[PDB]
Design a protein around this ligand. Sequence first.
Ligand code: NA
Ligand code: NA
Ligand code: NA
Ligand code: NA
Lengths: 104, 88
Amino acid sequence: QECSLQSCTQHQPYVVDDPCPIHFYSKWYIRVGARKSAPLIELCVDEAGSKSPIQYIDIGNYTVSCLPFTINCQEPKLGSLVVRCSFYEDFLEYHDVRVVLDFI
Amino acid sequence: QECSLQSCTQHQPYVVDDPCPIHFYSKWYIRVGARKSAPLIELCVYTVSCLPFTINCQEPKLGSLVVRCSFYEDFLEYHDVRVVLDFI
Ligand code: NA
Ligand code: NA
Ligand code: NA
Ligand code: NA
């Protein structure tokens, strides 16, 4: 279980520091209620060869961009922010990192 | 800046894993709010037991569990670790 502690100014945009190896793959999620037996919601979806923030689940004014992943600095009300890291597009083997924010 | 991710069943007792290096002293706090500079309320001096430190598995409503780690007993040179809970 790994944990990335980052700092930003609450309610201003923040480009999240990618805790995954940068030349490989990552996918950003919210884990509902930070409960591992609850759903894992992808924050970004592919539309036209590009990633854009999900629109079919309402998580408010949280995700600003998916290129690169940028949030409005806040803890998401819905749950925890989790990134899944993988060397491979198939994502069959991976590890997760939870990202937590101190407000500056 | 460091956080420790741990897992427990929400609202049931959890013996917290030491987030400090072996041999280091540890003191436990609830942080008042969400800023790094915020004052801390020391525990033991939500809490199920103080030996070993055992909590009711939950995020405190005031703020995060923080552990202060210090090699020397005088706690002059220290580092704090925020404990973050995933719920099972
Ligand atoms: Na990285
Ligand atoms: Na969180
Ligand atoms: Na997969
Ligand atoms: Na630290």
